Design goal:
part of a larger assembly, 6 chains, A mainly alpha (75), B mainly alpha (105), C mainly alpha (61), D mainly beta (49), E mainly alpha (53), F mainly alpha (378), A: 75 residues, Single alpha-helices involved in coiled-coils or other helix-helix interfaces, 0% strand, D: 49 residues, mainly beta, 27% strand, binds protoporphyrin IX containing FE, binds ubiquinone-2, Cytochrome b-c1 complex subunit Rieske, mitochondrial (chain D)
Chain lengths: 75, 105, 61, 49, 53, 378
């Protein structure tokens, strides 16, 4: 279902738009663009990054213990 | 009242800021998940609040689309954050719970 | 012992869909056996070429 | 053959360690390796089955 | 929060549906038994001893 | 009236890809639904062309697969597109499920539950796929797997022998697996349509988890082209894999013909089951291992009952985000461990990671939602 004209009630909202043939597809692409990705990165590192390094560490340690274990000195 | 309450209050303020709905000009109640109780409370809102709530959601979905965010001064400030829905939601729940009590006897 | 007969079947077993089902399932079990043996024996009589001969060859094992 | 903690058998799929009698000692294997029905017809021959 | 379904009416409801839930289970059982030919369960039934021993 | 809107056949198209009101803010993460759509068709098309030369007999199975790569014109790409597409199908599948979890999309019960059936089905499908070339890994993979079912009390031995068609993974077993691997993707498709049917009752969710009726756009310029750009990105990934590293995700041993006497020291699944494999062998029990193996997948059906937060998405929930990323990180660990022998480090870390997987989904994530509600005074 769904349709358009039966979704919900909206009042007093104007929407100015401009035709795609009158504007640029990539406005300040590098100018405003890159700052935004850095800002999006800041916003999320502390939530995405840590779990992963914990694995990165568990992975390298895990490998070292295993390979070092199949060796032996006395007895 | 003292040191402790402010500490729980500042922890709450901290979560709020971290939660980040404020950055999209949203208010806490604009983020509530819509179940029946909630759908009814939205319905019961007065004209003004209802209209303001749609503009906020629209402002946010738009921002969320181009993955931008509002200038810092326009973020909603914690505890200037009017919980407009709460009293309505509370009553709708209270009404449902009474129906539920009656349904047991 | 005739009008009251299908009447009892309905009263005691067909009214509820519970019993109705239970009865056809209990009824499927016995029927399977009775139809199988009963039809095997009809297939058995019209023939007598297969393993009726078994009595001979075997036993000597 | 000749692998594992018990000098018998080792199953690489989930870590089943067996001894020289075929008994399970480590890992998730529920029973000992099945001993087939067998007999010796002489000092140099064995008929399994 | 399933405390919504706890009260006298629901307790009356449960009882009214027991003979039915019980008879549905008898249907399911015999139905399972007869369909797989449950050796263990079947061998006890008087007739239907089509597995001799 | 129009033609699109009124015609019985076109209506369906119109209501699903043209005038469908879509949220204006869905991001890549929403592309994996169409990408799974493409992967499904790609798997069917290359899958059919392979079936035009493949033989389902142990005598010629491997040879026919070889016949395809050397002799059949362009048989090799078709074969690698198939193989690599199966992996692409799992990368997309995993993005899709994860997207649903992070964003609260699972609240659409029927859609999601149908999605679980779709996951199981392509899994059952891909497992049978891998056995077809009759390589050492095909046979021993087929062996290790099916035999799990023998842990089911009183019925397990008869069940395993029933699907085997003997006492081993033999002739009967290969042909069998061909037939099921042929019919399964069609059934998947009928289910993908029912999936999309239920999805249509509400329309899509979005990153904020807040309703978007207030700002919907037609699927008609916006998401047709965004799906297009995205399929092109799926092609890049797939083609990069097949035209430069066709065995990278493959096991060099499935290249040695099946030998029912030669057990490779290796013995591991295709990467997409490695996490479940790790969970399975973490348990020093036959029944429990397979009981928990199953539960590591069927748990997706418990997720909606464990939603505890007053918000739908995770966009506004930090504590929950951390727990989510720890789930993904824990799933890397699980696959990594699953691809490693059951000797030192590996046993105890893969054992604890298994506990964590279930502690996370079953206890930690819900508890976080309650805490978050509380911090918000909700
Ligand atoms: C043959 C496998 C699948 C196909 C073809 C399929 C196809 C799709 C399509 C086309 C969409 C709409 C666009 C999108 O959000 O991506 C979608 C959304 C969804 N699917 Fe699937 N999907 C499949 C597997 C799954 C799985 C494995 C699950 C999880 C158990 C799942 C649960 C969902 C849910 C909940 C949504 C709604 C997401 C939202 O709107 O935010 N589906 N799917
Ligand atoms: C009905 C459409 C399909 C057909 C007709 C089909 C047919 C085949 C045939 C004949 C083989 C053996 C040839 C070979 O190994 O290259 C095969 C292998 C395989 N297929 Fe399919 N299949 C289809 C859909 C799928 C699906 C849905 C998947 C799951 C993503 C899938 C994943 C596999 C895998 C993993 C292999 C073994 C790996 C390999 O390529 O060597 N295929 N398929
Ligand atoms: C021999 O190598 C192996 C595979 O490759 C052939 C696998 O695929 C899997 C896991 C496969 C499945 C289907 C688990 C899902 C079970 C249920 C009930 C959903 C394992 C454990 C494995 O050891
Ligand atoms: C508004 O949200 C939606 C999208 O934007 C994220 C999509 O991209 C698609 C794409 C689905 C397609 C092309 C159908 C494929 C299915 C099969 C069986 C081939 C759907 C349905 C949708 O609802």
């Amino acid at each position: 279902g769904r349709q358009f004209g039966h979704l919900t009630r909206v009042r007093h909202v104007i929407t100015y738009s401009l035709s795609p043939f009158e504007q640029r597809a990539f406005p300040h692409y590098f100018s405003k663009g890159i700052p935004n990705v850095l800002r999006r990165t800041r916003a999320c590192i502390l939530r995405v990054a840590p779990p992963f390094v914990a694995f990165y560490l568990v992975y390298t340690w895990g490998t070292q213990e295993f390979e070092k274990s199949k060796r032996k000195n006395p007895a | 009242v003292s040191a402790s309450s402010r500490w729980l209050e500042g922890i709450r303020k901290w979560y709020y800021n971290a939660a980040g709905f404020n950055k999209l000009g949203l208010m806490r109640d604009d983020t509530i998940h819509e179940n029946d109780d909630v759908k009814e409370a939205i319905r019961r809102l007065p004209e003004n609040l209802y209209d303001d709530r749609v503009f906020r959601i629209k402002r946010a979905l738009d921002l969320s689309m181009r993955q931008q965010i509002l200038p810092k001064e326009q973020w909603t400030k914690y505890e200037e954050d009017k919980s407009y829905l709460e009293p309505y939601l509370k009553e709708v729940i209270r009404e449902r719970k009474e129906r539920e009590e009656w349904a047991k006897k | 012992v005739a009008p009251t007969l299908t009447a009892r079947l309905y009263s005691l077993l067909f009214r509820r869909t519970s019993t109705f089902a239970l009865t056809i399932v209990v009824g499927a079990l016995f029927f399977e056996r009775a139809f199988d043996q009963g039809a095997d024996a009809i297939y058995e009589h019209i023939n007598e070429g297969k393993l009726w001969k078994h009595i001979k060859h075997k036993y000597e094992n | 053959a000749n692998a594992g903690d018990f000098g018998g058998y080792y199953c690489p799929c989930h870590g089943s360690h067996y001894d020289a009698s075929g008994r399970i000692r480590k890992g998730p294997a529920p029973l000992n390796l099945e001993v087939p029905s067998y007999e010796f017809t002489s000092d140099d021959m064995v008929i399994v089955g | 929060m399933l405390t919504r379904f706890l009260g006298p009416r629901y307790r009356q409801l449960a009882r009214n549906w027991v003979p039915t839930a019980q008879l549905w289970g008898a249907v399911g059982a015999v139905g399972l038994v007869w369909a797989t030919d449950w050796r263990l369960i079947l061998d006890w039934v008087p007739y239907i001893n089509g597995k001799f021993k | 009236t129009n033609i699109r809107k009124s015609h019985p056949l076109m209506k369906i198209v119109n209501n699903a890809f043209i005038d469908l009101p879509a949220p204006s803010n869905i991001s890549s993460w929403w592309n994996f639904g169409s990408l799974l759509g493409i992967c499904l068709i790609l798997q069917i098309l290359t899958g059919l062309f392979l079936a035009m030369h493949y033989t389902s007999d142990t005598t010629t199975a491997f040879s026919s697969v070889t016949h395809i790569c050397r002799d059949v014109n362009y048989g090799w790409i078709i074969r690698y597109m198939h193989a690599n597409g199966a992996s692409m199908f799992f990368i997309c599948l995993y993005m899709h499920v994860g997207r649903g979890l992070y964003y609260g999309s699972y609240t659409f019960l029927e859609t999601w539950n149908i999605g679980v059936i779709l996951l199981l089905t392509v899994m059952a499908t891909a497992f049978m796929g891998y056995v077809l070339p009759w390589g050492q890994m095909s046979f021993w993979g087929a062996t290790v797997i099916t035999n799990l079912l023998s842990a089911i009390p009183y019925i397990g031995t008869n069940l395993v022998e029933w699907i085997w068609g003997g006492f081993s993974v033999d002739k009967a077993t290969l042909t069998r697996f061909f037939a099921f691997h042929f019919i399964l993707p069609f059934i998947i498709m009928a289910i993908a349509m029912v999936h999309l049917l239920f999805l249509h009752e509400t329309g899509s969710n979005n990153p904020t988890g807040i309703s978007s009726d207030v700002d919907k756009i037609p699927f008609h310029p916006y998401y047709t082209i965004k799906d297009i750009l995205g399929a092109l990105l799926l092609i890049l990934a797939l083609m990069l894999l097949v035209l430069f590293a066709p065995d990278l995700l493959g096991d060099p041993d499935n290249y040695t013909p099946a030998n029912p006497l030669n057990t490779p020291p290796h013995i591991k699944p295709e990467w997409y089951f490695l996490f479940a494999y790790a969970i399975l062998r973490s348990i020093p029990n036959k029944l429990g291992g397979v009981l928990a193996l199953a539960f590591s997948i069927l748990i997706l059906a418990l997720i909606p009952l464990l939603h505890t937060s007053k918000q739908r998405s995770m966009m506004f929930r930090p504590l929950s985000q951390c727990l989510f990323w720890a789930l993904v990180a824990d799933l890397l660990t699980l696959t990594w461990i699953g691809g490693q022998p059951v000797e030192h480090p590996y046993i105890t870390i893969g054992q604890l990671a298994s506990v964590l997987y279930f502690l996370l989904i079953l206890v930690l994530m819900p508890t976080a939602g309650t805490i978050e509600n509380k911090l918000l005074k909700w």
